[PDB]
């Protein structure tokens, strides 16, 4: 027999005929396409790790770049939410002239009335 | 050691000898570009198999409660969204905008309210 | 024995007796709750993977749209970024109207003022 740990828990003995069970956890009880760890095998036998295409997760950090229920936040800086979008004190470029009445303007629209 | 099974999410079991080579791989998630395996698999000392991500992870979607990655953008369910097609402020306020300069650049109130100064 | 090969490593040999660990990695040296890979145990022994509910990464690629340590870029199109945003050289829309200074103005506010002067 040899001996598996996992992590921090107690060896599991693997004596002559046992089997030994690698499972992708769920994320969602009834989906067998919610596994965020995608475990299949190859041809020759090969175990063989992925990541879902989907994947569920409660948050994502890349350094400020924060993902959450929340929304998309940058620690310090722009971040957009349920509440709505918050440029961080910053300009807001790139800004194609607005035409709805809910679309926002530019500076050439201001310009355009100030000659006007 | 005694001969052993290996079960992967109900597959078939496959059969581990004396004398078996069994291989643990990561995938590629771009075809031909060997940094681009998702789950980094590594061996360090005392027979440590280590797992982790990589340092830059490929997916189509990333679900996160109401927040939602995917290759369209960056999009809040019942909310505003930043997407290829352009951002939608979600019938909400833009906030903490600076003042435009350039022609492309959005404007804010203070800037309204300077126009309403000059014009009449 | 039997051998454990890993990507291009070198083969480990497990003889009777010997022992195979799994490790999640720590993201961050000093929590141990930064694994990006949970690994744990069923009640039958079972090896179970998943992803913690909190990963840490440098980047995610989803199409042209990317998290990175700069914000939230989709290539070629709008971004949020450290620096602010860009609307990708399109228009923004469903934008309330503007109350405080620093608030976004909207075409109706623009016409409101229009048909004032």
Same mark, same amino acid.
Do not use: Y
């Given at each position: 027999?040899?001996?598996?740990?996992?992590?921090?828990?107690?060896?599991?003995?693997?004596?002559?005929?046992?089997?030994?069970?690698?499972?992708?956890?769920?994320?969602?009880? /009834? +989906?067998?396409?919610?596994?965020?760890?995608?475990?299949?095998?190859?041809? +020759?036998?090969?175990?063989?790790?992925?990541?879902?295409?989907?994947?569920?997760?409660?948050?994502?950090?890349? /350094?400020?770049?924060?993902?959450?229920?929340?929304?998309?936040?940058?620690?310090?800086?722009?971040?957009?939410?349920?509440?709505?979008?918050?440029?961080?004190?910053?300009?807001?470029?790139?800004?194609?002239?607005?035409?709805?009445?809910?679309?926002?303007? +530019?500076?050439?629209?201001?310009?355009?009335?100030?000659?006007?």
């Amino acid at each position: 027999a040899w001996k598996l740990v996992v992590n921090d828990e107690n060896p599991i003995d693997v004596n002559a005929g046992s089997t030994v069970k690698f499972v992708g956890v769920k994320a969602e009880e /009834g +989906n067998e396409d919610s596994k965020n760890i995608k475990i299949t095998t190859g041809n +020759n036998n090969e175990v063989k790790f992925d990541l879902n295409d989907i994947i569920r997760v409660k948050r994502v950090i890349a /350094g400020k770049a924060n993902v959450s229920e929340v929304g998309f936040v940058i620690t310090g800086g722009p971040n957009m939410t349920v509440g709505g979008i918050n440029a961080g004190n910053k300009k807001i470029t790139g800004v194609a002239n607005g035409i709805r009445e809910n679309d926002a303007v +530019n500076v050439s629209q201001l310009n355009e009335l100030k000659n006007q």
